[PDB]
Structure formats: structure tokens, C-alpha cells
Design a protein around this ligand. Structure first.
Ligand SMILES: NS(=O)(=O)c1ccc2c(c1)[C@H]1C=CC[C@H]1[C@@H](c1ccc(Br)cc1)N2
Ligand SMILES: NS(=O)(=O)c1ccc2c(c1)[C@H]1C=CC[C@H]1[C@@H](c1ccc(Br)cc1)N2
Ligand SMILES: [Ca+2]
Ligand SMILES: [Ca+2]
Ligand SMILES: [Ca+2]
Ligand SMILES: [Ca+2]
Ligand SMILES: [Ca+2]
Lengths: 398, 398, 398, 398, 398
């Protein structure tokens, strides 16, 4: 209207969008900086970059944008686009975005007293260190460092307001514990003046329901299935087939864990050593199966069973695991004697083979017990060694 | 021409593209906002972002862009590019695009009465919560929240017009149920004035023909093939080979389901638990096969069959499943006696082995029936537990 | 030079780049629109977006850009960049690009008579419906809809010129049948004036040499190899091994077909049902192998062969498939009688087992013939059911 | 300084950045165009797009940018950014980049005589036809076509200077043979004036060390391992296991070759037919193994060996491949006769089975020789059929 | 304020942002160039491009931006955006970014003496040669070449300041040894004037903990498991099954190494030849297993054991590896003689078969020892042949 047009023409006249809108040129300009977290887009641990949707909030007082409400009836707020009024140069210090700004420049509301208000949105890409030591029971502290690029503490001092949690969309993968912030002053050995900045520490923890059901339970079931080799009879030649097939199945799980894990080489991930232990147990089960088959397929009278081997396997382990089984009339006679002698020799050889097979079965059951104990101990210890494991289980699975 | 050039030179003179084109500066400016959905580009459930091709429609009245048709014959409409006339700052609140605008700024048609008209296109990227609880029988309600960034209800009030469905290209993957909208007013504890906005809720459901034929039918056939282990004779040593190979085949299906599913950890997807049940059934079939082979390859006289084992397997289950099968003249005689005695002992051992093998076959058939029942029950229950399953089947497969 | 500088200074003076360059402000401005297709970048059937390299061609007459050649010797053409002279706002209606323009704005040549000429290049991203019903023997009709955004038929009427095929780089994957176009007028229930637009329908067909050699021939060979199970003797326990391994091999082909196919759920792709039929045949071969092994490994005297089973398998199918094979002196005698009686019983059991094995071989050969017939019929019928299959084969493979 | 500021203020005055800087407006302006290739970023054969880092070099003479060195001491060169002085509109005709320009606009150095100099860098994306007929022994001729967009030969004629090879970073994958160029004139049937352009043909060949060690040697070793089936004895039932496993291993190599090859359907790649031949040989080896096992597991007296079969396998092939192996006293006698008669019958059956097994071994060795010859011939012929194969081997492997 | 506005209005007046701010127009302008490395984003060896987050630091003296502090109380620093004051055109020469600039243009602080200060951030993408000869024990020297685009040494000479390591975020994958820099002058055969530039050589080494635990240890364990074939008895037919399965497992490791390695064909990577040696050892183990099974399954009296074969295997290798095992009354007699003669012949054949089996076992143990030695030697030699292997192990694993 008439009054709004007159006000807009009056305010722009003799206004420099480069000068700091202070009335004395020496007193610092107080700028209240805060943000409003909306959602966490994707925590890319591969490149150690955090992508978030954040609405910044800046509020300062302008001395040259003040008018009288009575003299200009009706109009109470004026908005200026970029390049028309002075704005603070606050931007993310650790921004990993290519543009390095990642802010949509909107208008700046101005009240009758000149109190400007700036709410620039944007999909920020911060760069924070991401440790995967306790993956997937992981808690991350990503930091957003905001501050004026070319203003000191005696010209533009930052004042902090608490972040706005209201309106935050809950990310499925990550749970937001909170976003505490702190205002800090950095000094240089030039001028003895502060360089304040406002930094917000995004504290988030990873949810383990999806990662659990996709990596932990399948691994446990696969290891328990690999333990089945010791129950198959040695007569059927499919023991090492099952062992090598279950190890081949674990290979693709190892590949998946490698593809989802970063290339960080500062610590060993918990799930990495868990999978390593599981695959090592499977390989040792394969070796044990080879030994058991070597015992089972022992040549008749091809060797002598050692006394220690007997007294251990056939007695002590048998009792421990409840085992129980450890003229022409002369020529015809001389000819028929050989058949029965050969049959007796075959029976003795069969008895020796039966002893060897029972020793193999004893080794099978002993290794079944030992590997079950090892698998249970390794799984429980590795899973419960992670901090806040009980909290994550009670909050995800329950 | 002459008249059009004169009109363009007259309208621009003494015009501020920053002022709101109201005649009183206090009466609110009515802006009619609506959109025209064209197609759904891609529903990215991984990042919970919806990509759509939308033509916005804005219509307001400008007081300073009115002329006389008689005084300017021929010209009835004038178009101004960005930065030359005032436009509303309506933009998507929950836009996940990096630019946060995602609108191609076009010209604004102006009638003789000053009624402006704005139709900015753009590939919007909204951020909506996407639940995968009932995947793939899934219905999504994605929300598009539009509103003025820096205008209240007493200066620029939004009026809603129904979305334009005409011209919508049917997306292959998703079926558009509809796009209802609502106008809501948000109040602050500052000024007791409304802050209206227009939000459109895109209601879409996923089609299950592709997902069905790629995930459900192959899984059913794979489970039915895994059930074949109980039909193979135990004489051929290829039972656990088939079982472990079919489980290895299910492993890649699990990997695919993990790759197409988001990392959301708020609920267990229906197809996720379906695949888990199928693979658990396959693993239990492998365990049962191990038990059956242990029964089949039982050493002759290496143990005693328990009385309960006999009375169950060889009688009750046999009847339930229709089983039927549960001087020198003295020396020659003494020598030939041993051969027949050994043959009789071998025959008795063979009879015991036959009893054990029949018990193994009985267990095989019992487990075949039990696992067929379990697979059918699990598949039917999980598939029919999802809401609107019948609608999706009748609309996709028929 | 002097004359060119004078002409440039004269033309710009009193020129508005916003007015339509018509001499009467009521007669429509004729704009001749045409394009010049250069190459097809990538037909992304996943998102139903077509990417092409197109040089647009626009020609209109400007009334205010006319000068005298004699008065300005030497200079015959003047070029103005964007924002200096009026240009039509023609753009792709169904553009799926984020910028929605995808045009590099070049200069506009102007002749002495004011006939402007505009050739803006650009990598357009159109959105066309892509059906995969007859994949890979597929013919696509993608549509490029061009028209003025904010001009009617009484101010800027579009005139169509045929597309320029000369200079088109032949895309390897797709063969360009042609690009016919049509000019259509859309009417609104407001003003009874046309809204013309020029739309070009890109008609292209997919070449099947690469898709053939990568998907069809390997599938045929894999199915023919799966047919080999019926030729292996049942004595060697590696039948179901071969069957399950060939099915596992087909699994990755199914995964590839799923990865290259869109998520469209409006029709079943031809190659999809072809692969489904092949894998179903392989699974049925596995089931048949299980049945054959069940027949082969039949216990001696563990059951009675049914009369119908005999009269079918051992006679009718045997003839159909040319099968041919369907004091102390008393004690010694009484003792030796048992050995020969046991041997006779073993021989009878061996004869019964031989009958069962011959029945298994007969079933093997019958199923070999039946599955060969089924595979041939399914492959030929599915491949030849597609339209223009003969054209694609004669144009790709020959 | 003073003189530089005076010169800059003088040159800009009465200067139009739109006019061609010629002194007569009819004589053509000579522009010397050349480029300086730095590196080849990536040759994307999938989309037939070449990405290169190129520094363009343009030099023309400006008539209005001449000053006196004595009158302006110290200053000898002036630089103007974009939009301040006239520049040629030379750009890549076949640019596949979305922006279609892909040039970073820098300043233009001007000497005292007005000789301008322009060196705009940029990551160009040209579109060249890429044939994969002789992959990986491939030589590509990608073309970069540069020319003025809206200038003829009588206003702006292009003069060519040889490309600058100095400073070219050697790309690891591709070897740069050279970049010859040619200046050509295109005529239209309008005006009988040339339209010159400068095109540079980038001639590059692919290095085969990486592709060799990753695709050729592994394939050769895999085929040689597949040849081992004929050496395994038929007693162990693991022949077809090895054959089908090696074929399954070749399947992933086929998948890799498909993933690295474009979708071009104009010719069959050399490595494609090489892999096809290798996999066909493996499949034929599997079929031969099936035949050999059918011969080996032949039922005793289940058929008659044909006379031709005998005279070939047991004699001619045996000699060719050095094979060598082709009252109560009556009752007891009548009872014991049967045992020896049965043993004699078993011995005759064993002799027949031994003949069949020797025939199977003869077939095994014959097929070993034949398949070794076939594999060697196919590999050598396919590898040496490619042109410049010897050059690529001597330059990569040596 | 008043003084700041007056100063800003005074400085801009009669200022040309194109002239070099020197007081004599002949003396060179000293520009101090330095950078501040923050983090290494990703070292993409595939395209030989290095992505880093770098804050540039430029400092020069401006003659026209000097004012009096006393005359303008309070204001001590003024900031000008892009296009308002002269700035050096320093940019990365070897930038591989599409924009080629990759710098966020910020304000330029100016002191009372005119000493400007420029700190433009940006995510630079340099192009450096990346050799993978010693992967993963790799040390890279990537070079960042900065220099003025269109200024010589007599107008704008570059002065170098050491790079700022403080504030560098430690990248997980790469360890930063240091970033030494050097200032060099390039001369042309035109003018005998220097063209200085400042280049920083980023020296970084790859950490081997992740690559170690994912590629080296699994390969060692897989090779050691492949060595287990020689321990399995030949009676169980699962030797070549284990060998071919472990080779199939190594196939996916080869695929992973190919996917993570660049396409460079100038040298053979260390891990590439390591994996090649491991897979060659596995293949040779498979061949040895085939030979061993051929020896084990030798037909009775189907050939004669060579004298050299005996004296080697059964004696010398047996001792080397501690092996130990290398009227009617006439008719009945004549009938019973045959049974014992046949049994004696069978016993002799069994003895020959036992000799062959012992020879096979001797070959098995000899090959076990030989392949263990070969695997150990190859692994140790290849791993320790890389330079700084001990440093990388002591710094990553310890
Ligand atoms: N999560 S991970 O870091 O990617 C990962 C997962 C599993 C795994 C490793 C790494 C390697 C580190 C330790 C052993 C090695 C491997 C293995 C291979 C063969 C056998 Br027999 C036994 C064990 N197991
Ligand atoms: N769709 S999914 O969420 O990716 C998915 C699919 C299948 C599946 C799971 C997850 C895991 C969760 C439950 C068991 C576990 C796994 C499994 C592994 C070995 C055996 Br023996 C039996 C069962 N089955
Ligand atoms: Ca993530
Ligand atoms: Ca999707
Ligand atoms: Ca495609
Ligand atoms: Ca490539
Ligand atoms: Ca990397």
C-alpha cells in the first residue's frame, strides 16, 4: 500500500548492506544463534560425514531499520532478501558439503524496533569422527561448530539459545539422545580479543533391532548349525561337505560386514571380532572333522593304537560321556580250514576297525561338547562386553 | 507493440517488488494455493524421502498491476519474471532437497484486474515417515506441508483448492489412492494471530505383483523343495547336501530382502519374519535329517533300542502312517560249523540294522508330515495376517 | 566496428525484453518449433525417465530488430544473449530433470528483417511410460511434449517443423525407428482460445543381441544341462547334487533379471515368465530325481510292487522305449544246507532289487523324454509369442 | 596504480561486449583455437561418453583494446572477466554434459596491441562411439568437435593450432597414442559461406595387464582345472561335482564380463565369445562325464556290448593310447556244487563289469586328449585373432 | 554507525575491482599463499582423484584501502564481498572438480594499513597419480599445485607460508606423514620473467589394520584350510569337494580385490600376486588330490607298479616320513578247491590294492609337507618384500 511503499522507500535510502548495524561502531553487536533439528538424513560412517536437516535461527538488532508504527499505520514487519540488508556471516566451520554453505537464503523479518530475525534452512553435511569400536551397540557424538567467519568478539559476539527439539522427526536407524551445546571463546596471540562460537554436540545411539536380526541371530544360528557336523555318523560321507558349506555361508556374512563397516583402522569392531571368532570356530570344527574322519577310516592292522590313546579315549572319555561299547579225507579238511581261518582274520580286522570307529565317535562327542561350550562362551562374552548392551536390548527388542 | 510497450513501461514505474500488493496494508492478502500431481518419481524408504513431480498453483490479486483494456487495445495479459513483481514465499516446509526450493521460477500471468497466476513446476523431495511393518502389502501416507515462510495470517492467509489429479501418470510400483488435503492454523504465544498452511497427504499403496513374483513365490517353492529331504532314501548320501544347498539358496534371498528394506528398527517387517520362519524351518529340517541319518547309520549291536522307542516308532507311528515291515570226519564238521554260525550272526546283525533303518524311515515320514503342516501354517498365517491382503491380491494378481 | 557498434546501440535503445515483438498486440506471433535429435543417452526404465541429447530449433520474427543493410554496410547478423531480447518460453512439459529446463541458453541470431533464430542445446530428461511386457523384444513410444508455458494460441501459436534425423549417433542398445510428431490444441472452459503445443513421439526398439547372448542362450544351455540328471546312473550318488547346483546357478540369473527389470506391477515380463518356467522345470526335475532315487533304493522284500506298477513300467514303458531286461555224515550235510539256502535267499533279494532298479531306469528315461519335450515347447512358445520376434532376430543375430 | 586505473577507465568507456572487435565489420576475425590435454578421467563405454580434463586455448585480436605503452608506463597487460569484453562462443558440439559448457570462465589477457588470450579449463564430457568388438585389445578413436555456435566463416573463421601434449598425466587404464586434429568447413544451401570448425580425434588404446590378469589367465586356469574331470577315477563319485562346481565358478566370471561390457548389440566382443567357448567346453565336458559314468555303472548282463563298440574302444583306441587290459555222500556234493557255480557266475559278471569300466576309462582318456586340444585351439585362436594383440602383449606384459 | 558508513562510502568511491592494487604499476605485488589442511575426504584411486577439505590463506597489501583510525574512531576492519575489491586469481591447477574452482568465496578482511586477508574454504578434488604396486602397504605423494592463472612474477609473485597442520582431523583409512611444500618458478621462451607457483605435496600412508584383517588373515586361513585335503582319508569321497569349495571361496576374494583395486596396468599389485599365488597353490593341491585319488583307486591287476615307483614311494619316502606298512569223495574235494583258490586270488588282489593305497597315502603326506612349505614361503616372502612393512605392522597391529 501507500504506507508500506513509503516505508520501504525510506528504509533503503542511504543504507549500506556492508556496514555492521551498530550505533557506536565499537560496542559489539549481540547475535542470538540457535538451531532447530528436524531429522537426521544419513550418518555416513564411510566418509565420516553427518547429514542433517536443520533450521538455523539468528536474531540481531538493526539500528537503521526502525520506524514509527503510528506514522506508518498497518505495516508492522518488513522483509528484505539477500544483498539488501546486512546479515551475520555465521556458517558451519566443519561443513563437508561441496558448497560449504548448504543454506537456503530466505528473507529477514524486521520488527518496528529493528529486531531482525533470520531462519535459513538447509541440509547440512557436517564432518564428525565416527568410531565403530562397539558396533552395532554404538553411541556417537557428532559436533556442529557454528561461528562468524570474519567477526571477532568485540564486533559480533555470539549468544547461544538452546536447540529446538520440538518438530524432530524420529529417524528409524538412529535414536537421538539429545543435542547439548556450548559457547566457547578462542583467543589468538595477536589482539587479546575473544572469537566466540556456538557448537552443538549431537548425541545419538544406533538402534540394534535391524542390525541384530540381520547379523547377530543369523550368525548364531549358522554357528549352531555348523556344530551339527559332530552328530552326523561317519559312515555317510557328508561331514566336511556340511562344514565347508556353512563356512562358505559365513563368507558372505563377512563380506556384508566388510561392506557396511568403514575403513577405519584405529580399533577392531566388536561385531568384526565376533564374526572372526565364529568363523574360526567353524574352521576348527572342520579341522576336527578331518581328524575324526582320519580316525574313522583307519586301515585294518595298518598301525597300532597307542596305549595312552586307548586309556584316554576308550576308557576315561567313554566313562565321562556314558559310552558302553569299547586218503582224500585229509585234503578236504585241510582245504576247508583256510576258509574259516580267513573268516576269523576278517573278524579280527573288523573288531579293530570297530574299536577305531568307536574312538572316532568318542572324539566326535568330546568335540561337540567343547565346541558348544566355546561358541556359547564367545558369543555371550563378546555380546555382553559392549557398554550399554542391556539398554539397547531392552529398548530395541522389548 | 506500441500499447504493450506503453503498458509495460507504465506498470514497472514506481513499483516495489518487496511490498505486499494490498490496498490498505492491514487487510490480509488472500492467496489460493493448490498443486497438480503429475507422477511419483521414487519412494526412497531408505532415507524416508519421497520424490514427486508437482506443478504448484498460486493465485493472488495485485493492486498495482491493473490497467484499462480500452485504453490499451489488444493486450490483455502481462508476464513478469522473478525479481520484477512481488510473489508469495510459499515453499515446502519438510523439503529434503539440498536446494530446499526445488521449484523452477516461471513468469507470472497478470489479468486486466491484476489477478496474478503462478505455476512453478519442480521435482520436490519431501521427507515423510515410511513404515515397513506390512511390507510388501504396504499403504503409505506421505505428507506435503506447504506454507508461507515469513507471513502471518493477518498479512497473507492461505486458501486451499483441491489438488488436480487429471494428468497424473500412473506409477508402476505404487498405486495412488488419493491426495486429500487440509488447511490448518498454528498459533504462537506471542501475538494471537494464525499462521495458516496447506498440507496435502499423499495416500499410496504398494503393488505386490513384482514383489510377489520375486520374493514370495520363489520362497514358497524353495521351502517346498527343502521339504524333499525327507523323501530321499538314506542309502544315498545326499540328504544334508540338498538341505544345506537349499539353505544357502535362501541366504541370498535374505540378503536381497535386507538390501531392499530400510534400516528402520521400530518394527519387524512381515516379509522379514516370513523369511526368518522359512529359513528356521529349513534349519530344523537339516537338524531332523541329521537325527534321521544318526538313526539310519547305527552300529550293529552298538546299543539297545529303548522299549519306549520301539513301542512308539515301530508300532504306533507305523500304524498311523501305514507301515508294514517292522577220525577226520569230526574235524570237518567242527570246522564247517563256524562258517554257518558266523553267517547266522551276520543275519541277526542285518535284522537289527533293518529295524534301525525302518525306524529312521518312520521318523522321516513323520517329520515330512510335520514340516509340511508347519510350512503351510506359517506361510498362510503370515501372508493373511497383513491388512488389505485380499484387496492387494485381487487388484494385482487378478 | 563503427557500423556494428552503431547498430547495436540503436537496437537496444527503447527495447523492452518483456514485450511480445508483434506490431499490433492482437495478431498472434508465429513461432516455428523443431528439434534435432543427436543421441539417446540412457533409457532408464527403473524410474521411467528418458535421457536424450536434443538441439531445439526456434524461429520467430521480431518487429523491433530490423535495420537497413545499406545504412549499416558489412553487418548482416546481430546476436543477443539471455535477458536482452524477448524469447519464447517453450520448455518440456513432462521434463523429469531437477532444473526442469535442461537447456543451455545461447545467443539468438537476428537477420536484417528481424527473423530471430534460437538453437538451445541440452540433455533433456523426459518422463515416459515404459512397459516391459515383451522384454527384451520391446518397442517403446516415448513422448516429448513441448509448448509455451504462459502463452495462448491468440498470442503465440506454435508451428511444427519435422525433426532433424541427420547427425543422429546410433545408440548401441536401442534402435531408433523414427520420431513422428504432431501439433495439438488444448481448449479450456474459460476463453474459447487454443493452447497449441508440439509433441514428438520417439519410437525406439531394443536390440536383443546383447540381452540374447547374456540371458536367453545361457538359460537354454543351463536347462539342457539340468536335463542331464536323468542320464546319470543311480549307482553314483550325485544326481540331486547336479540338480540342486544347476538350480542354484539359475538363482543368480533370476537375481540378474530382477535387478535389470523395473518394479512395474502392471504386467508379467516375457523373460520373467520364461525364467520362471525354466526354474519350475528344474525343480520338477529335482522332484522326479527324488522319486527315481526312492524307487532305486528300495529295501529287499520291504514291500510288494503293485500289479499296475509292474504292467505299466516293466512292460508298456519297457516296450515303448526299447527296454529288454525286466553218524556225523548227516550233520555236515545239514550244516552246509544253510549256507546255500542263505545264498539262494540273497539271490532272490538281488533279483527283486534288480527289478526295482530297472523300474527306476524306466522312470528316468520316461522323465527325460517328457522334460525334454516340456523344455522345448516352453522355450519355443514363450520366445515366439512376442510380437516382432522374427524381425528382432533377423536384424540382431543376422 | 594511477596509470593502470586510467587505462582501465579509458578502455571500458564506449565499449560494447556484444560487437565483434573487427575494424571493418566485413573482414572475418581470425581466432586461433587449440587445446592442451591434461588427463583422461574415465572412458565410460556404458553411456559412450568420454571424460577428459582439457585446457582450451583461444587467441584473437581486439581492435578496441589497444593502448600506448609510453603513455601508460608500467602496465602492459589488462584482464577482463566474463561479460566485460567480447569473447568467441566456441564450445564442444558433441558435449554430453548436462551444462553442455563444462568450462570455467577465467579472465582474458590483453596485450598492448589488443591480442587477447583465453585459456578456459574444464572437465569436458564428449560423446563418442565406443566399439567393444576387440575387447580388451581395443583401440578407440574419440572425437572432440569444437566450433563457433553462431558465427560463420566470413565473420569468425577458426584457425587450428596443434594440441599440447606436454603436461599430460598418463592414465593407468588407457594409453594415449596421439590426438591428431583437422579443420573442416561445412556448407549450407543458403549462403555459400563456410562454417569452419576444429575437431581433435583422441586416439587411445586400452592396456591389457589388469584385464589380462583378471579375466584371461583365471579363465585359462579354470578351463584347465575343468579338464581334470577325465583324470579322476570313476570309483569316486565326485566327477560331476567338480565339473558343475567349475562351471558355477565360470558363471560369476560371465556375470563380471557382462557387468563391465556395454549393452552394445552391433558386434560380439572377443572376450565374450572367448568366455562362451570356455563355458561351452566345460558343459561338453560335463556331458562327456555323464556318458563316461553311464558306461562305468553298467548293470551286469543288463545288455550286450555292440561289436563296433568293442572293436573301436577295446582295440583301436586301446592301441592308440597305449592300453593293455581289455547215500548222503551225493547230497553234500550236489549242495556244494551250487556255491561254486554261483561264485563262477559272479566272476563272469565281474569280468563283464571290468570290460565296461575299461571302456569307460578309454573314453575318459580320449575325451581328455580331445578337450585339451579343443581348449588350446580355441584359446590361441581367439586371443591371436585380435589385431595388435602382439603389440599389446609386448607393451603390457613385457 | 556514522564513521563506518562514511568509511565504506569513501573507500568504494573511485575504486576499480579490476586493477592490481600496486602504487607504481611495475613493482610486483607480494601475495603470501598458504593452506590449512583439515581432513582427507576420500582417496579415490579408481579415478586417481584426491578429495580434501582445505582452508586456503591469502594475504596481500591493498594501496587504496587505507584509512586513518583517529579520523574514523571505532572501526578497524572492513569486509568486502566478491566483485567489490580486487582479489588474486589463485586456483588449483590440477583440480579435477567439474567447477574447477571448489572454493566458497567469503569476505576479505582489510586492516587500517590495507593488508587484506582471504580465507576461502572448499572441498578440493586434486588429480594425483596413485600407484598400487605395494598395496596395501602403500605410501602416496599427492600434489596440490596452486598458482595465479593470469599473473606473472613481475606483477604478482607468490610467497609461500608453511601449511597449518593444527586442526587436522585424523582420517581413519590414511595416516598423514606430512605436507611439505615448495615454491617453483616456470619460465617461458617469450619474456624472461618467472611464473611462480606454490605446490604442496601431501604425503600419506595407508593403514593396514582393516585391509589386513579383511584380506590377509582370511586368505592365510583359507590357504591353511585348503591344505587339509591331504589329511583326509581317500576312503571318504570328499577330497576334491573340499578343494573345489575352498577354491570357490577364494574366487570371491579375488573378485573383492579386483573391485577395490584400480584399473592401472603399469605394475602388478603386491596383494594381487599374493592372491594369485594362494589360488595357484590351491589349484595345484586340487591337481595333487586328483593324482592321489588316481593312485588310490587303482584296479586290481590292471597294471604293474614300476620299479622306480616302488623304490621311491614304498621305501625312500616311507623311511623319510616314518611309514611302516609297505567215488564221490574226489568230486567234493575238487569242488571245494575252487572256493579257496578264488579266496586266495581275492586276498592277493587286496594286497596289491593295499600297496597302491599306501603309495597314495605316502604321496598325500609328501604333498602335505611340500605345500605347507610352499604356502609359508610364498606368504612370508610376498608380505615382507614390501617396503616399510615392519613400520606398518608395528603401527597398525601394535
Ligand atoms: N567382520 S570382518 O572383520 O569382516 C571379519 C569376519 C570374519 C573373519 C575375518 C574378518 C578374518 C579375521 C579373522 C579370521 C578371518 C576369517 C576366517 C577365515 C577362514 C577361517 Br577357516 C576362519 C576365519 N573370519
Ligand atoms: N528378511 S531378513 O530380516 O533379512 C531375515 C531373513 C531370514 C532370516 C533372518 C532374517 C534371521 C532372523 C531370524 C533367523 C535368521 C535367519 C536364519 C539363519 C540360519 C538358519 Br539355520 C535359520 C534361520 N533367517
Ligand atoms: Ca549408515
Ligand atoms: Ca523404492
Ligand atoms: Ca537401460
Ligand atoms: Ca571404464
Ligand atoms: Ca578408497
Amino acid at each position: 500500500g501507500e504506507f508500506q511503499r513509503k516505508l520501504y522507500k525510506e528504509l533503503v535510502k542511504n543504507y549500506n548492506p556492508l556496514e555492521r548495524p551498530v550505533a557506536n561502531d565499537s560496542q559489539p553487536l549481540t547475535v542470538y544463534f540457535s538451531l532447530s533439528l528436524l531429522q537426521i538424513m544419513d550418518v555416513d560412517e564411510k566418509n565420516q560425514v553427518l547429514t542433517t536437516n536443520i533450521w538455523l535461527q539468528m536474531s540481531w538488532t538493526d539500528h537503521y531499520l526502525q520506524w514509527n508504527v503510528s506514522e506508518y499505520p498497518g505495516v508492522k514487519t518488513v522483509r528484505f532478501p539477500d544483498g539488501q540488508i546486512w546479515k551475520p556471516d555465521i556458517l558451519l566451520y566443519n561443513s563437508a558439503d561441496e558448497r560449504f554453505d548448504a543454506t537456503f537464503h530466505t528473507n529477514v523479518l524486521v520488527n518496528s524496533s529493528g529486531h531482525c530475525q533470520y531462519l535459513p534452512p538447509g541440509i547440512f553435511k557436517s564432518s564428525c569422527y565416527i568410531d565403530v569400536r562397539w558396533f552395532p551397540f554404538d553411541v556417537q557424538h557428532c559436533k556442529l561448530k557454528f561461528g562468524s567467519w570474519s567477526y571477532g568478539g568485540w564486533s559480533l559476539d555470539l549468544q547461544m539459545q538452546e536447540a529446538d527439539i520440538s518438530g524432530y522427526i524420529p529417524n528409524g536407524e538412529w535414536d537421538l539422545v539429545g543435542i547439548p551445546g556450548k559457547r566457547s571463546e578462542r583467543f589468538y596471540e595477536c589482539c587479546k580479543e575473544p572469537y566466540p562460537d556456538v557448537t552443538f554436540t549431537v548425541t545419538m545411539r544406533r538402534r540394534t533391532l535391524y542390525y541384530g536380526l540381520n547379523l547377530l541371530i543369523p550368525c548364531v544360528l549358522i554357528s549352531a548349525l555348523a556344530l551339527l557336523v559332530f552328530l552326523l555318523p561317519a559312515d555317510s560321507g557328508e561331514k566336511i561337505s556340511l562344514g565347508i558349506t556353512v563356512l562358505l555361508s559365513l563368507t558372505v556374512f563377512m563380506l556384508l560386514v566388510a561392506e557396511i563397516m568403514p575403513a577405519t583402522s584405529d580399533s577392531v569392531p566388536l561385531i568384526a571380532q565376533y564374526f572372526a571368532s565364529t568363523m574360526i570356530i567353524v574352521g576348527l570344527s572342520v579341522v576336527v572333522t578331518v581328524i575324526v574322519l582320519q580316525y574313522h577310516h583307519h586301515d585294518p592292522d595298518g598301525g597300532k593304537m597307542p596305549k595312552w590313546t586307548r586309556v584316554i579315549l576308550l576308557n576315561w572319555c567313554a566313562w565321562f560321556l556314558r559310552m558302553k561299547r569299547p586218503p582224500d579225507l585229509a585234503k578236504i579238511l585241510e582245504e576247508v580250514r583256510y576258509i574259516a581261518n580267513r573268516f576269523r582274520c576278517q573278524d579280527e580286522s573288523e573288531a579293530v576297525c570297530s574299536e577305531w570307529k568307536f574312538a572316532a565317535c568318542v572324539v566326535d562327542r568330546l568335540c561337540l561338547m567343547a565346541f558348544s561350550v566355546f561358541t556359547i562362551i564367545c558369543t555371550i562374552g563378546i555380546l555382553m562386553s559392549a557398554p550399554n548392551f542391556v539398554e539397547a536390548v531392552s529398548k530395541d527388542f522389548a
